[PDB]
């Protein structure tokens, strides 16, 4: 935001516990919020799986 | 304008989840001793 010149807003996760592949064929935590697609960005320690 | 790069990198971490990357190293360059390590 300081070297590109645009803006931001901040949510908080309702689970916040390294969100998981649920039994609902779904993701909780920070993960499914961007899969229900109801936030925009997530900046954390992300151990990427394929 | 190239959708396949995810489709590229899809296998890539999968290869990283194998280590077949290193298996593909071993053909053109094996990891063992040139004379004795």
Curated annotation (Swiss-Prot), chain A:
Q: Which residues are glycosylated?
A: 24
Q: Which residues of the full protein are shown?
A: 475 to 524 of 1009
Tissue distribution = Highest in the pyramidal and dentate granule cell layers of the hippocampus.
Q: Which gene encodes it?
A: Grid1
Question: What compartments host this protein?
Answer: Postsynaptic cell membrane
Q: How does it assemble?
A: Homodimer. Interacts (via extracellular N-terminal domain) with CBLN1 (via C1q domain), and more weakly with CBLN2; the interactions mediate the trans-synaptic adhesion complexes also with neurexins and are required for ligand-gated cation channel activity.
The protein, known as: Glutamate receptor ionotropic, delta-1
Family per similarity comment: Belongs to the glutamate-gated ion channel (TC 1.A.10.1) family. GRID1 subfamily.
What's the stated role of this polypeptide?
Member of the ionotropic glutamate receptor family, which plays a crucial role in synaptic organization and signal transduction in the central nervous system. Although it shares structural features with ionotropic glutamate receptors, does not bind glutamate as a primary ligand. Instead, forms trans-synaptic adhesion complexes with presynaptic neurexins and cerebellins, regulating NMDA and AMPA receptor activity and influencing synaptic plasticity through signal transduction. In the presence of NRX1B-CBLN1, forms cation-selective channels that are proposed to be gated by glycine and D-serine.
């Amino acid at each position: 935001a300081k070297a590109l010149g645009f803006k931001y807003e901040i949510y908080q996760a309702p689970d916040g516990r390294y969100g998981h592949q649920l039994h609902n064929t779904s993701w909780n935590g920070m993960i499914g919020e961007l899969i229900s697609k109801r936030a925009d960005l997530a900046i954390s320690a992300i151990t990427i799986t394929p | 304008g190239s959708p396949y790069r995810d489709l590229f990198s899809q296998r890539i971490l999968e290869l990283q989840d194998t280590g077949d990357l290193d298996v593909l190293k071993q053909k053109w360059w094996p990891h063992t001793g040139r004379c004795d390590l």
